[PDB]
């Protein structure tokens, strides 16, 4: 894989924290990460590599993969995206 495909995957794992898929290998475009031309294979196998680290939660359904944040995934992302902890994601917006 190239490195620029992976870097837009962690950004929607911080503010919301979840990432779904399709389990379609030959699917040429992942439709949620449009305008980047990343295949479904290159987000699905990347999250398979991330599940052996222990940073995404595995839950399957009829067809779609599902991947949640881990509680240790916030600290691993806040340095990899080089973010300050002063900004708050959707965890503590309401009430």
């Amino acid at each position: 894989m190239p490195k620029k495909n992976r870097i837009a995957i962690y950004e929607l794992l911080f503010k919301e924290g979840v990432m779904v898929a399709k389990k379609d290998v030959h699917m040429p475009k992942h439709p949620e990460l449009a305008d980047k031309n990343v295949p479904n294979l290159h987000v699905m196998k990347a999250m398979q590599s991330l599940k052996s680290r222990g940073y995404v939660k595995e839950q399957f359904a009829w067809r779609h993969f599902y991947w949640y944040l881990t509680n240790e995934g916030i600290q691993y992302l806040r340095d990899y995206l080089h973010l300050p902890p002063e900004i708050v994601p959707a965890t503590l917006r309401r009430s």
Partner: protein, 79 residues
Amino acid sequence: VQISKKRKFVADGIFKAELNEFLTRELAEDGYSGVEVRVTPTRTEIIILATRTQNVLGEKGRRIRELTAVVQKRFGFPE
């Protein structure tokens, strides 16, 4: 144009079947009982039944927040 009422009323079924299947598979530990999908063109709310409902929410409403974004980005309808 939209879809026919025959194909509309069945497509409301495969929504609630996949939702209930995914909800059983995820929430099979906190005593998941069933959904109730109240449809509305403004907000299609999904009422989760559970045994220990305070433990479903997470830390002051944290765990179900993940499931909101899951069902948002899954079934195509916007947030």
